[PDB]
Amino acid sequence: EQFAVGEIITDMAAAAWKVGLPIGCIYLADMNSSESVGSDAPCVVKVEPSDNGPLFTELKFYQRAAKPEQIQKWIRTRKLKYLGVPKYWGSGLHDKNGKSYRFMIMDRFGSDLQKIYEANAKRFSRKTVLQLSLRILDILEYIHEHEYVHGDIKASNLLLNYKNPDQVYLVDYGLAYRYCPEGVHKAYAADPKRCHDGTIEFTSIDAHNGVAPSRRGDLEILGYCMIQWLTGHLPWEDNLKDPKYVRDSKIRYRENIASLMDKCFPAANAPGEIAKYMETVKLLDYTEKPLYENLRDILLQGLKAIGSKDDGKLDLS
Ligand SMILES: Nc1ncnc2c1ncn2[C@@H]1O[C@H](COP(=O)(O)OP(=O)(O)NP(=O)(O)O)[C@@H](O)[C@H]1O
Ligand SMILES: [Cl-]
Ligand SMILES: [Mg+2]
Numbered sequence: 001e002q003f004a005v006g007e008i009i010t011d012m013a014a015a016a017w018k019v020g021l022p023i024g025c026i027y028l029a030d031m032n033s034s035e036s037v038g039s040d041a042p043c044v045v046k047v048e049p050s051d052n053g054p055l056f057t058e059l060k061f062y063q064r065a066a067k068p069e070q071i072q073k074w075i076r077t078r079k080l081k082y083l084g085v086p087k088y089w090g091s092g093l094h095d096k097n098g099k100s101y102r103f104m105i106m107d108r109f110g111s112d113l114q115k116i117y118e119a120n121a122k123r124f125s126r127k128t129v130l131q132l133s134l135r136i137l138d139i140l141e142y143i144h145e146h147e148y149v150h151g152d153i154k155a156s157n158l159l160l161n162y163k164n165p166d167q168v169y170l171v172d173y174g175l176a177y178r179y180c181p182e183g184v185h186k187a188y189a190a191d192p193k194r195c196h197d198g199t200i201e202f203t204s205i206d207a208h209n210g211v212a213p214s215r216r217g218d219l220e221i222l223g224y225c226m227i228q229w230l231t232g233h234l235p236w237e238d239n240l241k242d243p244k245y246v247r248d249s250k251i252r253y254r255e256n257i258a259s260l261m262d263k264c265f266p267a268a269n270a271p272g273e274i275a276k277y278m279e280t281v282k283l284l285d286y287t288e289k290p291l292y293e294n295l296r297d298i299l300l301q302g303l304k305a306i307g308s309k310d311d312g313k314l315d316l317s
Contacts, residue, residue, distance in 0.1 A: 002047045002094070002101055008032050009045070009103065011090035017105055019045060029105060042162075043089065044108045050093065050100040054174030059104050061173040062088035065146035074142060081312055082161075084139045084169040109159035109169055116316050117155050122232040126271055126306055128315050129229050130299050132158070132168055136222055137299070139170045141292040144215050147180040148173070151213040152198045153221045155229070166314045179214050185287045186212050200240050201228070205254065206286065208247035216284040219295070223278050227264050230271070235263050254282055273302030 003009070003019040010016050020028035020037025025048055028041035048055040066088040075083050089105040113132075117124060124132070136153065143150060150157075152175060161167035175196045179186050191212040198207050202224045204217030228234050235253065239245040253260040257278050261270035276298045284290060303309055 002096055003027060003045075006036060009092065009094055011092040011103075011105065013090055015090050017043070017045065017090070023108075028108065041108055043105055045103050045105055047094065047101050047103045050102050052102065055102050055104065057176065058173040059091055059102070061148060061176045062086075062104065062106070063091070065143065065148060078138075080138060082167050083142060084135050084167065085142055086169050086171060108162050109171070110162040110165070111160055113155035113158040113160075113168065116160075117229065120317070124229040125315060126230065126302070127308055127313075129226050130273070130302050130306075130308075131310070131312070131314050132229070133222060133226060134296055134299055134310060135168050136170065137292055137296050140215075140218050140222070141290075143176070144179075144218070144290070147178050147183075149177050149179045149213045149215060149218050151175060151177055151196075151203070151207065151217060151221070153218060153225060154199055154202055155225070160316070165316055166312050168314065177213050179212065186214070188286050200243060200246055201234055201237055205247065205250050208243060208250065211286075214286055215290050216281060216286065216288065219281045219284070219290055223274075223281060226274055226277070227260075230274070231264050233264070235260070254278075257282070271302060272305070273298050276301075 001024065005019065005021070007019045008016055009019060016032035017029050018032050018037050020030070020041055023044055025046060027045050027047070028037050028039070029043040029045040030037050030041050046055065066085055068087045071083055071085060071087055086106050086109070089107070091102070091104040094101045094103050140150070150170060150173070152172065153170065157170060157172045159169050159171050161169065177191070177194060188211055190210050194212060197203055198221070202221050204213060204220045206217045207213055224234060236246045236249040257275050261275050264270070277295060280295060280298060300310060
């Protein structure tokens with residue numbers, strides 16, 4: 001344990017918070033009061049030692065790109081219903097037993113998508129996948145425009161709004177990467193400071209090639225997520241201890257998208273927007289800016305094809 005239960009901690013902006021039970025490095029948290037922190041807590045506090053690299057990285061992301069007003073101004077300007085980027089609420093330093101810790105306050109979210117996926121026998125419907133992906137595309141556009149790539153989009157990093165199950169949020173920026181510091185795009189090479197390569201089954205060909213992640217890589221990761229969610233599988237899932245096999249398959253399947261559709265979907269029965277999205281992402285150069293509205297239009301055609309529309313309904317349960 002890093003905190004005493006009911007402990008009051010004060011962040012760098014002098015806002016006071018109260019610590020509750022773990023949700024062991026994440027606790028329920030709320031604004032300081034006489035009341036005890038309950039299971040209905042609107043916040044969480046993440047705490048790690050001061051020397052922990054991922055919390056520092058994550059905190060720098062939240063401080064630079066997730067301030068409540070910069071998020072609200074984006075939502076207003078882009079006329080969005082919401083933006084699945086968790087808001088930054090504060091951070092500080094905390095001492096315990098002569099050891100220095102860093103903490104960060106963020107909103108409390110509900111279930112991860114991986115649990116809902118596993119309870120639905122490892123399937124999400126076409127409507128769900130298109131609705132999730134439209135929101136993920138808004139999220140990616142936002143973080144990319146704020147000089148960052150996520151590099152690790154997957155169902156376990158996607159959380160529902162604790163009070164609204166039609167609102168999904170992308171979490172975990174511990175290994176996010178600033179691909180465009182001060183508007184200067186990174187070169188096609190490895191970052192010496194950066195070690196990680198994402199989640200093997202979903203990671204980009206760029207990551208497999210040992211180069212730093214860029215915008216096309218996050219869009220390619222979303223592509224593998226869509227197939228996985230729609231079919232319950234990926235062609236290379238039985239060879240995940242062999243990264244050169246996983247890369248070889250991804251390369252061969254990018255080169256011939258129709259054979260990927262033939263492999264993943266029942267014979268001659270593949271949703272067309274998936275192949276079109278993948279062909280679009282395939283045309284991006286390492287440093288090129290994606291045309292997000294074009295990608296979102298590809299998915300909207302998919303919603304039209306099933307006789308639906310972008311009504312923001314995730315259709316989970
Ligand atoms: N703001 C949040 N609200 C609610 N739950 C959260 C929040 N942030 C993280 N969690 C969940 O808490 C768990 C641990 O979080 P975290 O350590 O940051 O993720 P991780 O490193 O990617 N995975 P793992 O260490 O294996 O649990 C996960 O199941 C998260 O979905
Ligand atoms: Cl199955
Ligand atoms: Mg997390």
